[PDB]
Amino acid sequence: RFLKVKNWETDVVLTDTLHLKSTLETGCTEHICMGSIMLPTKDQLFPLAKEFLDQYYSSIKRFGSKAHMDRLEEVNKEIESTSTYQLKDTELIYGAKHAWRNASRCVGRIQWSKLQVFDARDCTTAHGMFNYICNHVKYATNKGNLRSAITIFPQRTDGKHDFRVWNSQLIRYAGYKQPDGSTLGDPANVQFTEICIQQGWKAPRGRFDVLPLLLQANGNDPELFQIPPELVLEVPIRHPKFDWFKDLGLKWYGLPAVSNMLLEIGGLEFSACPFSGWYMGTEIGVRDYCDNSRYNILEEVAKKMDLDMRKTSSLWKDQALVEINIAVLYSFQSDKVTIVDHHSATESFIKHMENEYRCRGGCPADWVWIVPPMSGSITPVFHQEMLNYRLTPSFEYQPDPWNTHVW
């Protein structure tokens, strides 16, 4: 019942009682752990709303108050009559902040309470979505001094009028399969870069073409829009020593902004809820740049450094990796764009965990995702035991729209 987690580097032990409120399943059983798998009605709704409202009222120290009771009945009546309900602005803000607070795979949750929420529940068209999104991008980019934000479009009704942002992230580079059998640009977006053409986009066929938003409103077919170039802050990457680095012709966008998840608050589902914060260096330097199935640039950087790539044990990949990540952090920092390194981010998360353990009784966390993709054990989270479990409000995964949309 009362579990404990120990940090093997500092011997600190914390007791976990928050998991006892867990609702959703984990995919694991007492017989098999699936910790490393990426993706493991009115009657149904009122209980969910109640769970939510109770925690909301408790958070504002009015648990059991008349207001609490009053609200509880009002929603109940609305569900019984409308088969759904609308959240109060306050409940919306609280819900969004808590879905972030509950995101077990996010290392930057110490920032959870500082989130700007844009209520786009009055939106009705794709052009309106485009308008709300540009405003979001501009707000969060803030000339390089990034601010976390989320824009929340209308909740699901009958499933046949869902709002969706077809892009996986608001800002990403296109990818095209060339005759050479090779891939141009970002390989992960090949299929998306094509659906933009299948729709009309005029691909400049470059190695870093900011893709076009493909917005779907109220259920209709998605429409294209080109984010005002002046709104997309990008950073050219140079090394603070290797002058040849720039010649690689590398750059990355400054706004990390996930747009394909589903936000669940009190039983309600928000299928279009783009959110953004600021980067941790490794996401770009290690994953976007060095992943084999991504820009896969290790060999090139290695050759440029004249390293013995004959034998794996000279660790040329490792040496290069470090430089490629020193570069990213260097550039961003030079151009004054917010960014955090894995050492600082993980240290933060540990502080946050301790706070969450003493003020909430726990902090759900997925070790597989929390530990950086490079230098694992020299970051504190590596030695930190973590308990993973699901709490609502939450951000959930949902099917790519192009595999569900009936045109």
Ligand X SMILES: C[C@H](O)[C@H](O)[C@H]1CNc2nc(N)[nH]c(=O)c2N1
Ligand Y SMILES: NCCN[C@@H]1CNC[C@@H]1Cc1cccc(N)n1
Q: In the chain, which residues are last before a break of more than 2.5 Å from C to the next N? A: 40
The residue whose two tokens read 């020193």 is 326
Site for Zn ion in 21-60 (CB under 5 A): 28, 33, 35
* Contact flag: residue 107 with ligand HEM (CB under 6 A): yes
280 binds, among a copy of itself, Zn ion, ligand Y, none (CB under 5 to 8 A by kind): ligand Y
Q: Does 8 bind ligand X (CB under 6 A)?
A: yes
Instruction: Please pick, from the candidates 212, 254, 267, 277, the single residue that binds ligand HEM as defined by CB under 6 A.
Output: 277
* Residues whose CB falls within 8 Å of the CB of residue 32, separated by 6 or more in sequence, listed in order: none
Q: Do residues 37 and 388 make contact, with C-beta atoms less than 8 angstroms apart?
A: no
Least distance from C-beta 369 to ligand X, angstroms? 4
Q: In degrees rounded to 5, what are phi and psi of residue 391?
A: -125, 150
- Catalytic center residues: 106, 109, 278, 283
The residue type of 288 is: D
User: DSSP assignment of 124-137, as one string?
Assistant: -SHHHHHHHHHHHH
**Residue 301 Cβ, how far from ligand Y at the closest point, in Å?**
20
Count of alpha carbons within 13 Å of 97, Cβ hemisphere only? 16
Choose between 357 and 395: whose C-beta lies nearer to ligand Y. Answer: 395
Is 382 marked as a binding-site residue?
Answer: yes
Of 212 and 372, which has the nearer Cβ to ligand Y? 372
CB of 65 to ligand Y, least distance (A): 36
Cβ atoms of residues 388 and 366 within 8 Å: yes
Closest among 274, 282, 351, 283 to 109, alpha carbons compared: 351
Q: Considering only 128-136, 263-271, 275-283, 318-326, which stretch makes contact with ligand Y by CB under 6 A? A: 275-283
| Site membership for ligand HEM, residue 290 (CB under 6 A) | no
Tell me how far CA of residue 113 lies from CA of 51, 305, 333, 349, in angstroms: 21, 44, 25, 14
CB of residue 256 to ligand Y, shortest distance in Å: 4
- Within residues 87-126, the interface with ligand Y by CB under 6 A covers 108
Q: Which of 217, 233, 215 is nearest to 225 (CA)?
A: 215
Number of residues interacting with ligand X: please give it, by CB under 6 A.
9
Pick one of 102, 216, 325, 384: the residue that binds ligand X (CB under 6 A): 384
Site for a copy of itself in 16-55 (CB under 8 A): 19, 22-23, 25-38
Phi, psi for 227 (deg, rounded to 5): -45, 120
373/51 Cα distance (integer angstroms): 36
Nearest to ligand Y of 108, 222 (CB atom): 108
> For the CA atoms of the chain, what is the radius of gyration?
23
Residue 369 known to bind ligand: yes
Residues in the chain: 407
Binding site for Zn ion (CB under 5 A): 28, 33, 35
Binding site for ligand HEM (CB under 6 A): 100, 103, 105-108, 111, 115, 148, 150, 258, 275, 277-278, 280, 283, 340, 345, 395
What is the binding site for a copy of itself (CB under 8 A)? 3, 5-6, 8-9, 19, 22-23, 25-38, 281, 286-287, 290-293, 298, 312-315, 317-319, 321-322, 325-326, 329, 333, 341, 343-344, 366-368, 371-378, 382-389
- The residues binding ligand Y (CB under 6 A) are 108, 169, 256, 258, 276-280, 283
Binding site for ligand X (CB under 6 A): 8, 36, 38, 368-369, 382-385
